[PDB]
Design a protein around this nucleic acid. Structure first.
Ligand code: MN
Ligand code: MN
Lengths: 161, 612
DNA sequence: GACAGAT
């Protein structure tokens, strides 16, 4: 009885429930943290992950998100551009990322600049928040210094736009 | 032993100018048997022999193309017959001017022809229209010889004309064949579609009685531009966006209005947080300062397209009225040829002397005298299409000598001419960047160091703004108020005449002498209505036609078929494709579209029932 | 009766 998988997760993020971790194991041989991470990348988070983000995160009364947490992008919109000309160059690009874990949702705003995240970033892509992230008016202020685009590949309904 | 050499120009003005240049001044001018074209005679040297030179001028195209009898009748032939089994013959344009008989009687006894016609595609077609009328009248050749000649020229200066006369070539039959193929395709397609539409929509709808419904390679795309703008206007949803702006109150007497670097947001809550973490602050810090020097570049030489756009926008004249005024000014001798695509001054052009004539006019006497005394600036290099030099003034005029509407056109042309020769506009662009809490702001100014062409064209100036206060990095200025503004995106407006000419020029729809006409035709057929600001608003008849074409066959409205057909016709000019083969294939391609149009005309009829 | 485009 050595759940070194859960041990490594408790140190390197990836809040996943018991059902999720047992469903992301491709073989009943032993702990393979690397391939669990790979399968989680290839799998949707909404059905496997546990609940990490505090309740009422989308409102006030919360100021900081502490700790490294992996979260799944579900929608991305350029706020600084109209719904018609989404690629307009009349304003600096600002992205409103709808982000989630298995249960609770949250919204983040591209504050400084993020080249890694683009408008064509596929939904299901996973992002790791590191350090203390500032939550202002219910928005996670995301910059290039606290955002690691881990990458992923999950079914694309975006292809049908 | 003497020989007569006949030269033919495309217009009496060019005929007279070239005769005066080539004769060194000896010419005897007498009008011919038409009352509009004169003959200038002199004596010179040609091909190592003394010759007598006769210069004459055609007036535009000698001949147009029309159907034979029983086919010009509206109700006697099916329009579908106007593609293959409809003979076409070249008849005379302006039959009042005898033209053909005039050339025949002035070519009797001639031993050489030097065609001095325009150096464009239509010029060669007019050259061969002259040749098929003069060639069977001249004397027989002996031992080969090169009786037919062609002089290539764009400028009407002494040196340019002498060089053109020293360098003589031969006419190109392939360009004439290309122009003839274009004329045939255009005539057949337009006549067939116009006849079918007019006969169909007049016997069904009583409102369209005695109304012409015309289709053409240019009218239909020109109307489609306006209809597409109307589609954008109708299918537009305003969107609400918020802009955050702040005021800084340095030196207790000014209030700089700072601009937000991220120009706009489309989320109410995002704008709210941006205001929330900014409003409760009282010190604004300075992070950057720029004093970059910039130049506003002088205009290129004036061409007919730019003249028409400025006439429609600033002066307030339609393209047809502007063209008529320019033609009257050119006839009276005040401006050059008014239909040019060239924006590059000829190398031998006399800029300084032409600018010397406009030194006594009170409006720009000081500027011209300053330019001539302190040296002029080399004009910009632009396109040098070899048809005509750009529109430039060549006579001093005053508001009394000219009218109330020709003077405005003349004033712009002469103001444009001085601007091209004048210097550039050099201005500073100061920028100060402010940090108000987490967020940034900028304040952009502009001050003029030395106006150049601006003093001749005051409307193309740099607006006067007070200089931004001096400040370096680390300077702290109290901030008065930061406030969020709610704004909505504005729907676009209807196409202006200036905008339409750009799209017509870009897509190759119409020519320099046909852009005013095509805009006027669609106005006369009640397709578009001219509104305030020279805007073209599509009518109900205009919308149903363009929309109906999209349902039936889009290949009749898109502004790409005209370039596609011209590219195919360009193969005749280069000799890669035969004349008959391209004409037969292109007509056959359009013939099946006509049959599809006729058998699928219920698409338009659905859209016609709602209105008429 | 008219048409196309272009000079
Ligand atoms: Mn011409
Ligand atoms: Mn031309």
């Amino acid at each position: 009885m050595a759940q070194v998988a859960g041990a490594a997760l408790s140190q390197a993020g990836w809040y996943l429930s018991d059902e999720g971790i047992e469903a992301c194991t491709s073989s009943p041989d032993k702990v393979n943290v690397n391939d669990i991470i790979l399968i989680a990348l290839n799998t949707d988070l909404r059905t496997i992950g546990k609940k990490f983000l505090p309740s009422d995160i989308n409102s006030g009364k919360v100021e900081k998100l502490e700790g490294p947490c992996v979260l799944q992008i579900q929608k991305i919109r350029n706020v600084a551009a109209p719904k018609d000309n989404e690629e307009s160059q009349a304003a600096p690009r600002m992205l409103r990322l709808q982000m989630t874990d298995g249960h609770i949702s949250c919204t983040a705003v591209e504050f400084s600049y993020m080249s890694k995240i683009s408008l064509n970033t596929p939904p299901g892509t996973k992002v790791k928040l590191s350090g203390i992230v500032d939550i202002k008016n219910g928005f996670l202020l995301l910059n290039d210094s606290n955002t690691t685009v881990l990458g992923g590949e999950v079914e694309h309904l975006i292809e049908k736009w | 032993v003497m020989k007569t050499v006949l030269m033919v120009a495309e217009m009496p003005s060019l005929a007279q100018s070239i005769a005066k240049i080539l004769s060194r001044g000896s010419l005897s001018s007498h009008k011919g048997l038409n009352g509009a074209c004169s003959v200038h005679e002199y004596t010179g040297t040609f091909a190592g022999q003394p010759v007598r030179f006769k210069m004459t001028s055609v007036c535009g195209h000698v001949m147009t193309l029309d159907f034979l009898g029983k086919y010009n009748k509206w109700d006697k032939v099916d329009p579908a017959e106007l593609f293959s089994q409809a003979p076409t013959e070249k008849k005379e344009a302006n039959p009042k001017l005898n033209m053909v008989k005039f050339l025949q009687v002035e070519g009797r006894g001639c031993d050489y022809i030097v065609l001095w016609l325009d150096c464009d595609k239509e010029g060669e077609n007019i050259c061969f229209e002259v040749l098929d009328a003069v060639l069977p009248v001249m004397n027989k050749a002996h031992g080969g010889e090169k009786t037919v000649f062609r002089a290539r020229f764009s400028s009407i200066t002494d040196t340019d004309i002498c060089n053109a006369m020293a360098c003589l070539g031969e006419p190109d039959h392939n360009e004439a064949l290309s122009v003839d193929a274009r004329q045939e395709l255009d005539l057949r397609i337009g006549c067939a579609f116009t006849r079918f539409q007019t006969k169909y929509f007049q016997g069904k709808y009583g409102d369209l009685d005695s109304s012409l419904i015309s289709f053409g390679p240019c009218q239909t795309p020109t109307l489609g531009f306006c209809v597409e703008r109307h589609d954008k206007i109708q299918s537009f949803k305003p969107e609400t966006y918020w802009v955050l702006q702040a005021k800084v109150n340095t030196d207790k007497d000014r209030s700089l209005l700072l601009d937000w670097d991220r120009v706009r947001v489309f989320d109410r809550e995002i704008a709210q947080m941006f205001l929330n973490m900014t409003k409760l602050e009282k010190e604004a810090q300075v992070e950057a300062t720029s004093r970059k020097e910039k130049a506003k570049q002088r205009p290129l030489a004036l061409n007919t397209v730019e003249m028409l756009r400025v006439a429609s926008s600033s002066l307030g004249m339609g393209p047809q009225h502007a063209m008529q005024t320019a033609e009257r000014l050119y006839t009276q001798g005040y401006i050059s040829y008014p239909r040019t695509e060239t924006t590059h001054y000829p190398e031998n052009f006399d800029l300084k002397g032409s600018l010397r004539q406009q030194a006594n006019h009170p409006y720009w006497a000081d500027t011209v005298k300053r330019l001539l005394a302190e040296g002029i600036n080399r004009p910009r290099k632009g396109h040098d299409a070899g048809d005509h030099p750009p529109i430039t003034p060549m006579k001093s005029a005053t508001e009394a000598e000219l009218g109330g509407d020709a003077w405005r056109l003349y004033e712009y042309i002469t103001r444009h001419f001085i601007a091209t020769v004048s210097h550039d506009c050099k201005y500073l662009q100061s920028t100060i960047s402010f940090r108000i809490g987490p967020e940034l702001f900028t304040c952009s100014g502009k001050t003029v160091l030395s106006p150049g062409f601006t003093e001749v064209m005051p409307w193309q100036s740099v607006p006067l703004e007070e200089s931004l206060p001096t400040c370096q990095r680390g300077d702290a200025f109290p901030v008065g108020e930061v406030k969020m503004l709610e704004k909505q995106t504005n729907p676009p407006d209807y196409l202006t005449e200036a905008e339409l000419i750009t799209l017509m020029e870009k897509h190759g729809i119409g020519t320099d002498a046909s852009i005013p006409v095509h805009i006027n035709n669609i106005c006369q057929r009640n397709y578009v209505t001219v509104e305030s600001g020279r805007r073209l608003k599509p009518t109900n008849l205009g919308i149903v036609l363009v929309h109906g074409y999209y349902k039936i066959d889009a290949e009749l409205v898109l502004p790409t078929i005209r370039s596609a057909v011209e590219k195919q016709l360009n193969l005749i000019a280069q000799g890669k494709a035969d004349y008959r083969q391209v004409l037969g294939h292109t007509l056959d391609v359009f013939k099946r579209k006509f049959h599809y149009f006729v058998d699928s005309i219920a698409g338009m009829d659905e859209l016609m029932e709602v209105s008429f």
